[PDB]
Model the fold of this input.
Amino acid sequence: QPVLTQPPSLSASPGASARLPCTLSSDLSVGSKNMYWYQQKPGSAPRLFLYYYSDSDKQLGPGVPNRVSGSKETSSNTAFLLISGLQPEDEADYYCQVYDSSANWVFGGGTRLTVLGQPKAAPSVTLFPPSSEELQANKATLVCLISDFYPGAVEVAWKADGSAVNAGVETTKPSKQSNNKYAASSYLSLTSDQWKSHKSYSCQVTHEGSTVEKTVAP
Amino acid sequence: VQLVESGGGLAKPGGSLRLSCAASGFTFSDYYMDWVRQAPGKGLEWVSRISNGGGSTWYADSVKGRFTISRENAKNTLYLQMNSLRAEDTAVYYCARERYCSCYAGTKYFDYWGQGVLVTVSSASTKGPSVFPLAPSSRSTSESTAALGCLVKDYFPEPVTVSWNSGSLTSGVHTFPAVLQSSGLYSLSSVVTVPSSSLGTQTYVCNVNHKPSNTKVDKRVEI
Ligand SMILES: [Zn+2]
Ligand SMILES: [Zn+2]
Ligand SMILES: [Zn+2]
Done:
């Protein structure tokens, strides 16, 4: 079956051109294929980004800047999505697609485009104690919300009266936000008697060697 | 030009579901339509294709024999019938319009997409969430900003929609992606950051909607 091969991840410098490759399998010939590139940002549907057959047969998607274009390397059987003047706005997943009579719609695996040089940002941490209604149900969930950090790598540690907590912790992987910073959350599931049996609880977020800590008290 | 989908949700393995895509703002009977699929965290995979007249269908190998793409032009509705559902069928499903044209002769790219509906195939039971207020510690209320929250706890079928004050409070909302705990259930949280002064000027209620369990709760958060 025809295969469109894309790199899962690709990072480029701001103010420079990004060259997103899409190599077609030997079954197809790039010179004679309509290439369709789609853009997908987190939480939204894909949108048509660039239709490219040749230099005189381009078509940009509605709302797509003039900075983007296409290219073909026939000795590699590779199509290229070129994005000059790269900005943080251009961070998205880009999907390559062609049509074939056998396997009608064929998508590439997609490429996450990363724009480098974005400022580092410390995590903003909010710790919430269990609600009264939850306590009346004999349960207690501590909630720790971590937002607006860059890069997207944190690690959370829970403490109860300074002592490390191992059971009942569940932490999300980081997620891209609208402003290209990341968010993450950690939950401490306890019973009502485990809560109120300590003077306080701490959520401790480590980000590139620095640490932010919040505490709540029964 | 609108492609509004509906009909997702939870289905037991071997079960069935039907997806719908209502179209508006164009001659629906003039365009090819398609269903595209996206597993959580994975890429796009084409599922099905229907011509404008409806007499020509196309299916991907992973789907042949189990799904059926339909079209009702009298009501501008695209259908995706899904039988003998497998766990690998768990994904977000999109409808997409194929452009009309009449070697580059057929350009044929996907002009408009639907919003996507999540289908989850699982033997687990539907469980609606408990909604708990996340109230500040009265020390940030004597600061310049305060953070209010809602905890949407222990719901199995994704997704859950969270709004604040019936959609009228959007500036300063963080709705966090859900955590999947080892019990198989999901939990998410939402916080609004507001000026502490605003705590004396308005009330705060979060609108939590979990459609798979018919659980719609408007939770007041008092400080
Ligand atoms: Zn840091
Ligand atoms: Zn924020
Ligand atoms: Zn202890």
The first strand of chain A starts at residue 4 and ends at 5.
